[PDB]
């Protein structure tokens, strides 16, 4: 909707400023490094808990290409690297993975340092670890 979902249990660190909390089980191995995922996403600012982005709400999921994605989604990355198909989860981002230092001017409008929030529901990915 535009409300990021409260969600008890601890969080499972993945970096030093990343973090996860899992609301939907998925099915299926994790994504391989280099791997294309489609997702749908909602991020919100931290601080200020103001939503910036949702594909969701303008009907247009992203293709985030692993080990290729963006600077500002560096994070957001990292957390997906850990989910499996068909699943949802809260990933917890430092500031340092997302717009940095800075932020972003407009457009969206994100404050410096500013950790972010991340309701992430990935459609699937193109390539997954097979043992």
Same mark, same amino acid.
């Given at each position: ?31 391989? &490094? ?16 103001? &939503? ?48 940095? &230092? ?30």
């Amino acid at each position: 909707g535009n409300v990021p979902p409260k969600v008890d249990s601890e969080a499972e660190v993945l970096d030093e400023k990343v973090s996860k909390q899992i609301i939907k089980e998925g099915h299926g191995s994790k994504p391989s &490094k280099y791997s294309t995922c489609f997702l749908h996403y909602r991020a919100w600012t931290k601080n200020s808990q103001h &939503k910036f982005e949702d594909t969701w709400h303008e009907q247009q999921p992203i293709e985030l290409v692993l080990g290729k994605e963006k600077k500002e989604l560096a994070g957001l990355a990292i957390g997906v690297a850990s989910m499996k198909s068909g699943e949802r989860a809260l990933v917890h981002v430092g500031w340092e993975l997302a717009y940095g &230092k800075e932020g972003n001017f407009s457009f969206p409008n994100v404050p410096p340092m500013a950790d972010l929030l991340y309701e992430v529901e990935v459609i699937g990915f193109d390539e997954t670890k097979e043992g």
